[PDB]
Every structure is written in structure tokens, then in C-alpha cells.
Amino acid sequence: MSRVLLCSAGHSSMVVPEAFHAVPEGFEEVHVFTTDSEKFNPVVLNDFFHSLPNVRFSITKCHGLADILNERDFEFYQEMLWQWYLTKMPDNELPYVCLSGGIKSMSASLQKAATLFGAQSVFHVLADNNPRNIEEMFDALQKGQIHFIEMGYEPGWAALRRLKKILPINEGCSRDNFKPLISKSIEEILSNVKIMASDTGKSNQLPFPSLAILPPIAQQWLQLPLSANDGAWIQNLPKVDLHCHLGGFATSGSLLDQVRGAASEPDLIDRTFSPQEIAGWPRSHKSISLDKYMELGNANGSKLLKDKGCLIRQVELLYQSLVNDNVAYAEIRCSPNNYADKNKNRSAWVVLQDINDTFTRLITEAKQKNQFYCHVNLLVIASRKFSGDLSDISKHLALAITAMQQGEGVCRIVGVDLAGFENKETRASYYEHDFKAVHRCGLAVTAHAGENDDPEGIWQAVYSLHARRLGHALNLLEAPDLMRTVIERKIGVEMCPYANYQIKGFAPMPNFSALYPLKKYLEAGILVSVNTDNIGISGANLSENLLILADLCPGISRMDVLTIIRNSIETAFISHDFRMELLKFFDRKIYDVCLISIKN
Amino acid sequence: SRVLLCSAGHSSMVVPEAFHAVPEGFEEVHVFTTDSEKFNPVVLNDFFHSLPNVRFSITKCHGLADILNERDFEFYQEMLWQWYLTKMPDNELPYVCLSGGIKSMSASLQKAATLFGAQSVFHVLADNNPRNIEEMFDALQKGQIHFIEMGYEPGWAALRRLKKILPINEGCSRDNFKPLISKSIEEILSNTGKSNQLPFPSLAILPPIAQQWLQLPLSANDGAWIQNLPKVDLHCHLGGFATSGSLLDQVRGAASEPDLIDRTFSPQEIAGWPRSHKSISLDKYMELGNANGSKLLKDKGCLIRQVELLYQSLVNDNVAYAEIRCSPNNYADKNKNRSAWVVLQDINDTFTRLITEAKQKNQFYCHVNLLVIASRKFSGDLSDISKHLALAITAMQQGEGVCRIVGVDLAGFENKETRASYYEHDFKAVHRCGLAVTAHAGENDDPEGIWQAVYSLHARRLGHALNLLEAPDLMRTVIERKIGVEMCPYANYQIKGFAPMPNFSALYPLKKYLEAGILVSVNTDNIGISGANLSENLLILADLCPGISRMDVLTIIRNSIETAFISHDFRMELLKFFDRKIYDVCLISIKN
RNA sequence: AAAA
Numbered sequence A: 001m002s003r004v005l006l007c008s009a010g011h012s013s014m015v016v017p018e019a020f021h022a023v024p025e026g027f028e029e030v031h032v033f034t035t036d037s038e039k040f041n042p043v044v045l046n047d048f049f050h051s052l053p054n055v056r057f058s059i060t061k062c063h064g065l066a067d068i069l070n071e072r073d074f075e076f077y078q079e080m081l082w083q084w085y086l087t088k089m090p091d092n093e094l095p096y097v098c099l100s101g102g103i104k105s106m107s108a109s110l111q112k113a114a115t116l117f118g119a120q121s122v123f124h125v126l127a128d129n130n131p132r133n134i135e136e137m138f139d140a141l142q143k144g145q146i147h148f149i150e151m152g153y154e155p156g157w158a159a160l161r162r163l164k165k166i167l168p169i170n171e172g173c174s175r176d177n178f179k180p181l182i183s184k185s186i187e188e189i190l191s192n193v194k195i196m197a198s199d200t201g202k203s204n205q206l207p208f209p210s211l212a213i214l215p216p217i218a219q220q221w222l223q224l225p226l227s228a229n230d231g232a233w234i235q236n237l238p239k240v241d242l243h244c245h246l247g248g249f250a251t252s253g254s255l256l257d258q259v260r261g262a263a264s265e266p267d268l269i270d271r272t273f274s275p276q277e278i279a280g281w282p283r284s285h286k287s288i289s290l291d292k293y294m295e296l297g298n299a300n301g302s303k304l305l306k307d308k309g310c311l312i313r314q315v316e317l318l319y320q321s322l323v324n325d326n327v328a329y330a331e332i333r334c335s336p337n338n339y340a341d342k343n344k345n346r347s348a349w350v351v352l353q354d355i356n357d358t359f360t361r362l363i364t365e366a367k368q369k370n371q372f373y374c375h376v377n378l379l380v381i382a383s384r385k386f387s388g389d390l391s392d393i394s395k396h397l398a399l400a401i402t403a404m405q406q407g408e409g410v411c412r413i414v415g416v417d418l419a420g421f422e423n424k425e426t427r428a429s430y431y432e433h434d435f436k437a438v439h440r441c442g443l444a445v446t447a448h449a450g451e452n453d454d455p456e457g458i459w460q461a462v463y464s465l466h467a468r469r470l471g472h473a474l475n476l477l478e479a480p481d482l483m484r485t486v487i488e489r490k491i492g493v494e495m496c497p498y499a500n501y502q503i504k505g506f507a508p509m510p511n512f513s514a515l516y517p518l519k520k521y522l523e524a525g526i527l528v529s530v531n532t533d534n535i536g537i538s539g540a541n542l543s544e545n546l547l548i549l550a551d552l553c554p555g556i557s558r559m560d561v562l563t564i565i566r567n568s569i570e571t572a573f574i575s576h577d578f579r580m581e582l583l584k585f586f587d588r589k590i591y592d593v594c595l596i597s598i599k600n
Numbered sequence B: 001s002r003v004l005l006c007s008a009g010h011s012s013m014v015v016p017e018a019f020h021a022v023p024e025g026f027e028e029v030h031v032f033t034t035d036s037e038k039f040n041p042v043v044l045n046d047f048f049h050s051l052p053n054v055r056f057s058i059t060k061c062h063g064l065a066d067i068l069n070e071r072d073f074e075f076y077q078e079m080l081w082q083w084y085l086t087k088m089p090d091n092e093l094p095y096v097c098l099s100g101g102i103k104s105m106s107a108s109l110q111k112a113a114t115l116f117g118a119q120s121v122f123h124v125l126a127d128n129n130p131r132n133i134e135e136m137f138d139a140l141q142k143g144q145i146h147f148i149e150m151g152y153e154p155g156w157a158a159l160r161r162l163k164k165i166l167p168i169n170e171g172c173s174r175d176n177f178k179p180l181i182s183k184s185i186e187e188i189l190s191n192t193g194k195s196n197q198l199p200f201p202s203l204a205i206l207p208p209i210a211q212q213w214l215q216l217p218l219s220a221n222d223g224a225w226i227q228n229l230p231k232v233d234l235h236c237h238l239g240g241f242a243t244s245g246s247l248l249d250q251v252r253g254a255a256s257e258p259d260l261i262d263r264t265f266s267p268q269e270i271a272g273w274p275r276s277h278k279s280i281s282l283d284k285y286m287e288l289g290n291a292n293g294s295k296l297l298k299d300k301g302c303l304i305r306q307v308e309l310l311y312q313s314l315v316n317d318n319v320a321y322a323e324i325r326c327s328p329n330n331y332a333d334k335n336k337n338r339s340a341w342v343v344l345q346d347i348n349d350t351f352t353r354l355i356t357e358a359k360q361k362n363q364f365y366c367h368v369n370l371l372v373i374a375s376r377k378f379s380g381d382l383s384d385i386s387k388h389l390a391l392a393i394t395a396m397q398q399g400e401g402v403c404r405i406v407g408v409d410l411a412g413f414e415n416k417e418t419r420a421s422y423y424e425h426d427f428k429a430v431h432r433c434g435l436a437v438t439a440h441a442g443e444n445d446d447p448e449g450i451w452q453a454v455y456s457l458h459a460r461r462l463g464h465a466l467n468l469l470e471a472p473d474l475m476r477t478v479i480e481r482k483i484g485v486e487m488c489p490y491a492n493y494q495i496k497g498f499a500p501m502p503n504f505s506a507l508y509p510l511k512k513y514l515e516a517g518i519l520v521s522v523n524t525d526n527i528g529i530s531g532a533n534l535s536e537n538l539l540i541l542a543d544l545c546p547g548i549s550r551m552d553v554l555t556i557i558r559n560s561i562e563t564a565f566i567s568h569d570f571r572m573e574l575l576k577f578f579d580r581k582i583y584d585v586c587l588i589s590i591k592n
Numbered sequence C: 001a002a003a004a
């Protein structure tokens, strides 16, 4: 807690100590703006506050203006004062303001600034002597001559105070190229209120993260369709990834080599599989069969992560890639049974516990140093095998159910994945009774609909399995009833632009004329979420997946990207309170990044 | 308007120099000052006499001088606010300058201007500080006197009804003071998911004072605000509206055959109704509605009159969307060849005709959709559920119409045989046909029944269901699956009994449900039986659930919108209209 | 406590 005290004196320097001793409770620091006029005496303030080293103090000098004469001088001074105020809030709390010194215009400007950005209390100091000595204020306050007038209490706009990140890179705002950016901010607020009032039709609604305060130029830029040039804005955007397999993250290249390196014992590590030739990845120009695409990732996965060191390195690298992409929430699909090995007492449960422990350690160590971190949950993928061993699905479900009971931990199991061969041999109809247990235990269910997904199959998945999220399902608009049901039941679809681009084949690949249905789904209201599926085999992260929508779905707007992020948040398997916290954080970060992108 | 506003001090220059702030002449200027003898009005009066058109008004703050004391400052601030509101121009915002006066008075005037609106806040300055009016003429001729204006201010639209609630009070002292606005200002931050749950994103454009007032707890005195709100009703039985009073008389008098109408029997009255101080069983609750219903609505004319009166009451309550539950078989007789289908068609046609007529006249209209009630064990054999399900499925195919059947409702009386887990067999067709399922899983129902209705019957909404707090697993299942609960505060308060009704200590779980995240909605059940429309049903929350905020009421309305059985395309435009209306009413209801 |  720090009670920053703000004041400003014309030439009479007695006001600042008067304000300091107005409240005998004491404060933490005082910051005062003053002109560069020679009539002002900072030596008195320096020597008076030097007696209290425990309280910080500073003086900011407005160069180039001894006094306010014309409109230009006052405007530039107001810009400078707004900037200095912006650099001097408490990190979380509000400051205090006094208006006993200075000219009328500058005091009114300071009060306007306090109203705009908010303050704990706005007051003045009054005395019946107006003295000039310093060894008399103590006698005046002992007798009671000092009078303080408290009138102000104001929250301001949180969004209008969120722009403390716009000020720097301004070389001191010299006269030759001065930029009144806080003047642009006040034009922003005035314009927002004026379009809100004088207009009714165009000023109705549209913001999905409830921003509604960005400058109107920012809103117009958001409405315009994005291009491949918006990669800088997309990269800074806090994104959500919901479909990201753990075993298909580092399948080739330097990441694969360095995950092979820290693999505990390197004796059992062998150089198997190979990348695919003529495939101009990640922007392939030919369809790839699902089996061949899966085999492309065989370099890393079930046969490689069987040792603890390799698995730990893989998950650490995945978390590093996620945080490097500004992904603020992720849900990693992992198959613990694949990496289980009873030979070394490495069951599926201990593999899942290792993944959970390393993710929690990474998130906690990132939170301790106060840096960007990716809160990641896990999905126990209950894949279909049916090479015998029908108990495999039951074991996966039981492990997923019993893994929730950890209770604590920043990383936790949230749901299961119904992947596998989506053929009619393993439709969702048979498992209406297996999944009563998984539903009663609070787990969520996500399903795969990559191929041979008849609308009856998806109906069974969303009505018998009660899947709250679907995978791919690129042919929803073929069946209008299925699309209507998905719309009404508010279930989301995990659509991966690169995986669907390569596996199924969409425009502008030659000999393929099918259009990507992401834009049509968004218009229909489908809670679509752009994901990665496999960072390794697909070869691209979430930023590139969002960028490619400029080509797969022409005319897609940036506001639609914000809609996609909001839908990913809404369809995520998280509790209500955590969802609201995530929504607040995403709103704040979206506001900041939009302001930065529009200004630069 | 064209009104200037300024403060006075030692020098009288301030008003003459501010007079020519506009470059094309001004209309009328007013001055506020204290009782200090230093100020002379003679110079300003003489200077204004040269221009007889301008209205000169001088107001002296009685009994105050130099504003040196805390109480003196508070007195001056209160009188300044009263004078500012009394001198508030009717339509156009006024200009204001604050160069003169003490820093304290200047700050108070700036706060007043930024709180009640201002056409512009500006300043006057002169390098040489002139004294003789000849020096002002010289200054305007050779142009040193600049005009300093930090930027045009919007001001907050609604703070002017205070000038109506307070009289002139020419004679005043320290006895009279109104902390009406300072009470909301003090509690601005003096009081986690509140801000995150902010619905209707245009609420961010609201004034910070208005936003703070929105965060304040609900009170019984803001019925005027709660009435002007556009609300959504999702649980409103058609046959429980015109039960007693003039409504019953005018719905009976419009019957085609008044001879067969029984005008003798009337429902009993309970003291304190609708805020009954004693609990009542559900059977007697339905008994109150015996005046209307099946035995009355058989006649076509009276049924049409009932529908028209219900729509008129919905519009009068400023409800912008409703989902009326009707049981066509209850009002269908074969004596005059009146099947259930023709009854449903008559209700639908009356509703769509009313909506179209109101829309073509560009008035406020309530969009109405119908729910077909599939009652259990009412008329004997249980083929009625199948007949009603088929009726709903066929009636949803009509296509054309602003009013359409959107789903079915399942009705259970108390418990056990009235459980929502016996008829799971019929509902595959109704799910696949595009309809939505709602269950009356209320009035002390066990968690297993609600769970079965949620999962086996795929119900999208649950009626009442006040016992979710005792089943945390069920509560989590409801929360994560985004299944709304429609609770009627008045019906539950009258039947179940909660605080502050005497002899009962249980408290309504409305606030707890809102905090948990359940998409809870507030409805009317039966307007006639409960004797309470949606406005007062929402208002009674401030009494049943203390600490509920107005922003929580807005969240309740948003939840009602979200859980409605509407298409996404219609939902988007409904949300847009609701956001605009909410912003408009909030911007013109902080006025009190 | 720079046109108190």
C-alpha cells in the first residue's frame, strides 16, 4: 500500500508541506509538477523533505513554459501533466490530490485529471495567515489555524487509466515533434460517448470481450478484414488453445533433437521415421491421409516418451512454446497409457502425475516471478483401440475420474477425449452406460469428428455422450438440424485451420474447391475455437493458425478473431469463478494490445 | 439556452470578460457569489445595462464569507448545487467558467458542472490584470485576453429531477441539507466477479457515477427504474393471468355465451396478499386460480380476450420478450368442434396479430413465444403427454409468424409420481424436431430427478428447483452445462416461505445462485394467482435477498435472454435492442 | 497560496 500524494505549486512552495501535514496519518511519497519558472524555489521543499528519508519525493519540471499564456501552452502543459500523472499511480490503488497551489487553469486541469483517472480523495488546505516561513506551520497546526477541505471521491474510468502503457518512446515530448497522445485519449472518450448518444443504430452493440471503450479508429480497424500483415497484432493477442495433443508437439527438428538429448538414458533412443518429402509444410499443396499424417508424427510419442526425462523435457518445451505464443490458457490432450511402462514401475497414473507435477511447477515458478504464464489443464484422451483389450477405454475413464481428486494444483484434469477410429464400429451409441460414471463425477467430454462422421453419429455424440465440445466437424452445415442443435445447446467445435487444411483440403489448394466453413459457422453463431491439434506435425503454432484464416476464409475480420478467442474461453472446461477471472484478464490484455496495435 | 455561469471574487472583471467568450454575441449570463462586502455589483450592473437583452441574475450566499471553515464550505457547496439545479437550462447544457472565486469554490463549481453537465468549461486570463473597463476595451481591441478551454464536456445526462424534487427554498439555513449524491460518491470504493459479470457492454459508456449507482444494493424505492427496464419472462402460464378483479370481469364479459359463465364463485382472500405473511400449500395456490382456466377459457371469445389482456399487461410491464405456457387441451372442447390444435392456432394468431399491429404502429411490443405443456396425470389416461408432444411438434412447423412454438414444458405437482424421470421414452422425437424441453422440477424435488431431467431428458431449463444448494454435484452439473433455472420469487415466497416472512428462517438462494454462476431468471409463474407482475417480482428480491445489486438485476435479465429458446440470429438483435434500451433508461434514471 |  502506497498513498501517492499529488500537488502542484505556482511559486508558493508552502502548499506541499501543508498538504503533507494536512493528514497526520502520514503518506508514502509525494510528487509535484511545476513549471520551469525561475521564481519557483525547490530548495525549500528539498530541505524540508530531506528530514524524512522514509518518504519518497520528486519534482517534475515542465520545460519551455514559465507560465500559461495561450491555448497552445496550456494544452501542452495539460498533456505533460496527464502523462506525469499516468506515470505515478500506485500499481493497484489510487493516489491523493491537493489543489491549494498554482494558477486556476492548472489546478482545474489537475482536478480534471484526477476525475478522469480516479483518486482516493481530493482535498485542499486552508490557513488564516498565508505565511512564508517553515518553522511556523507546526505552531499553526498545534493552535488549529490549519484547515483542510475534503470534497472529492471519484473512481474514474478503469479503461481510461489502463492506457498508462502508451506514454513512453516519446523522447521527452520536445517542442519540435510533441505528440499530445492523452489528448487523443480524451478525444476517444468524448467520441465514444457522442456516438453512443447522437446515434442509435450503428452504436447498438458488437464487442464480445466487452471492451467498447477503444478509440473509434480502433473500432473501425477491428471491423476491417485482417491480412497476413496482422501477424504482429495476432502474436501479441492473448489466445486460448483447446485442441493440442502432447505427443505431437516436438516431432521433428531442433525441438525433437533436444528432447531426445535430455532423455535420461539415451541407450534406448533410436532414430526412427522420417519427414515427408515434396510436402511444402506447413502450407502443403496436396491432401494427406489421416493415417499418413499420424505416421508423420511417429518420430516422437508413445515409443519415445516412455522415459521420465524425455517426457519432462517434452512438457517443459510445450509450456515454453505456449507462453512464447502468448497463449494464456491451454488444455493439453495426453495419453498416459501410451507412455506407461510397468517394467520401470511407470504406470499410466504416475505418468499423468508427472505431467501434472511438472506443469504445476512451471506455472507456479512463472507466477512467483510475476511474468506471463499459461494456465494449462489436461484432457485424458480415452482413445479407441479395439485390438483386443476392451478394458482400455474403461481404464482410461477410471484414471481420468480418479485424477480429479487431487483437488489442489494449478493444473488439473478437466475432461476426457473420445478420439480414435470414428468409424461406425465405435459409434457413441454403445457407450450411453459407460459414461454415466464420467458425467456424474463432473468430468467433461470432448469428441472427435474428423472423418466418416455421419450426422447421426454427431447426434449420438452430443445427445448420448453429452459431449460439451466437438472436434473438427467441418460438415455441420450439410445437416441444418445438426447445426441448429449445436447452436442451441451451446456446444463448441474445435476447428484447427492447419490440420483441416492439410487433411481434408480447402481453398486455395489446387484441385480443391471446398471453402473453409469457419466464417459461415461464426455467422451462424457456432462456438468455434481455433486450435493447433498438433504443433509438430502440422508445423505451426496458434498464431499461424489464426493468421491462415485470412486465406482459408477471405473477408474474416479482426473482431471475428476476438470472437473466436471469446468462444474458446466460453467453451473451455473451467469453473465459473475461474472463467470470470480469465474473462477479466483477457479483456484487460485485449484492451492493452489493441491500443498498442492502433497506435503503432 | 445559451447560459454562462461564473463565480465572483475580489475583482468584478470576470463576468465582462467572459461575456464575449462566444464570437457572435450571447443571450443570458448568471453570477453566483457569497456575502462578502468586497464585491460591488454596481460595475457589473452598469455594464449589463448597456445590453438590456441579457438577463442578469445575482445570487448571494447568505451568512457566508471567504469560505474558511469545513461547515461553511459544505453549506456553500449545498447551496451552489441547489442554485445550479434551479438555474439548470431546460434542454441545452450551459456554459460555465470558474476563473473567479476561491480554489475551493472553483473546485466545487467544476464538480457541479461535471456532475450535471456543461456546454463548455472555459477560462479567462489577462496578462496585465486590468481594472478600469477602458482597459478591457483596450484588451479586446489589441487582443491579449486569451480564452483557455480544456475540451468540451459531455456531462452526465440524468441529474436534473433533483431540481424538481427540491423547491426554491429562498429562506434557508444549516438545518436543511441533502446528501443524495454524496452518499453514492462516498460509497464509490468504500464498499470480485461483479465487474467481470458486466452484461450489455454499452454499460461501460455509462458515467462513473451511474456505474457506481448501478453497483449499489437494490432498494424498494427504485420501482420506477425497475419498471422502465426491458425485461424477459420465461415462466408465465396463460391460464393464471385473469383470475380476480376487473380483469376477470372484463374477460368474462367478452365471452361469446355469457349465460354459461359462472360469475358466482370467487377465490378467497388472504391478508397481506401478495406479500402473504403465512405460507400456503401448492394445492390451495392452484385453487386461487380456479376462477379462470379450463372451465372458463372454453369459449373462443373469452380465450381471445384473455390472450389480448395478457399481451396488454406484458406490454404495460415493459416486458420485451415472453414465453407464455399454454395447455391447449385444457381449453379444447368437442361440443363446438374446437380441437386442441385450433385452440393453439387461435392463441398463436391472436398473439401474432397483436404483435404485428403494435409493430406497424412503431410502438413498444412484446415478442411472445408459446410453450406446449405436457401435463402428467391430470385428465386420467396418460395419452395426453403423447398428444401434446405431437401437437407441439406439428405446430412448430407453421414457419410464418412472429409468435411461434419453441418448446414443450413438463409439469409436476409436488413429488414422486410427478417426477421428471418416468417418460424418457417419448422425447427422442421432440429433441430431434428442434424443440426445447423445460421441466417443473421444483417444489422440493430430490436431486436424482433433476439430474435425470438434465441428462436423460436433455432439459435446457428447470422450473424453480430451489434445492440445488444441498446437492453440490448437481449444482456444478447445472452450472457447467449452462442450464438455466426459472424461479418465480413471489410464487416461491408464497408457497415455500422464506425471509422476511414471519416464522420462517430459510432464505432465498437467488443471490447464491447468481454468485455461483447459474443462469438464473426471474419470472411471474401466474400473474393472476400470485397478484404480481414481473416488475414487482424483481423488486421483491431486494426484500427476499438482501444485498442484491442493481447490476445483479441486469445480469438476471441477461441470463433470461441467454436461456430463452430463440435462434442465435434473433438472439443477437434482441441483445442489441436490450443493450440500447438499458443504456437509454440508465442514462435517464440516475436523474432521481 | 499567480489574475482571492
Ligand SMILES: Nc1ncnc2c1ncn2[C@@H]1O[C@H](COP(=O)(O)OP(=O)(O)OP(=O)(O)O)[C@@H](O)[C@H]1O
Pocket: A245, A246, A247, A248, A294, A295, A297, A298, A299, A300, A301, A302, A303, A335, A338, A381, A383, A384, A419, A420, A421, A448, A450
Ligand atoms: N486425430 C486423431 N484421431 C484419433 N486418434 C488420435 C488422433 N490424434 C491422436 N490420437 C490418439 O493419440 C495417440 C496418437 O498416436 P500415439 O498412440 O502413437 O501417441 P501420440 O504421442 O499421442 O502421437 P504419435 O503417433 O505422434 O506418437 C493414439 O492413441 C490416438 O488414438
Ligand SMILES: Nc1ncnc2c1ncn2[C@@H]1O[C@H](COP(=O)(O)OP(=O)(O)OP(=O)(O)O)[C@@H](O)[C@H]1O
Pocket: A328, A371, A372, A373, A374, A375, A581, A582, A585, A588
Ligand atoms: N497468464 C496470466 N498472467 C497474468 N494474469 C493472469 C494470467 N492468467 C490468468 N490471470 C489472471 O490475472 C490475475 C493474476 O494476477 P492477480 O491475481 O494478482 O490479479 P491482478 O494483478 O489484478 O491481474 P493481472 O495479473 O492481469 O494484472 C488472476 O485473476 C488470473 O486469473
Ligand SMILES: Nc1ncnc2c1ncn2[C@@H]1O[C@H](COP(=O)(O)OP(=O)(O)OP(=O)(O)O)[C@@H](O)[C@H]1O
Pocket: B237, B238, B239, B240, B286, B289, B290, B292, B293, B294, B295, B327, B330, B373, B374, B375, B376, B378, B411, B412, B413, B440
Ligand atoms: N405448478 C404446477 N405444477 C404442475 N402442473 C401445473 C402447474 N401449473 C400449471 N400446471 C399445468 O396447467 C394446468 C393446470 O390447470 P388447468 O389444466 O385447469 O389450466 P391452467 O390455465 O394452466 O391452470 P388453472 O385452470 O388451474 O388455473 C395443467 O396442465 C398443469 O399440468
Ligand SMILES: Nc1ncnc2c1ncn2[C@@H]1O[C@H](COP(=O)(O)OP(=O)(O)OP(=O)(O)O)[C@@H](O)[C@H]1O
Pocket: B320, B363, B364, B365, B366, B367, B570, B573, B574, B577
Ligand atoms: N419490443 C421491441 N421494440 C423495438 N424493437 C424490438 C422489440 N423487440 C425486438 N426488437 C428488435 O428491433 C427490431 C424490430 O424492428 P426491425 O426488425 O424492423 O429493425 P429496426 O427497426 O431497425 O430496429 P428497431 O425496431 O429497434 O428500431 C428487431 O431487431 C428486434 O429484435
Ligand SMILES: [Mg+2]
Pocket: A243, A245, A471, A533
Ligand atoms: Mg486431434
Ligand SMILES: [Mg+2]
Pocket: B235, B237, B440, B463, B525
Ligand atoms: Mg409454473
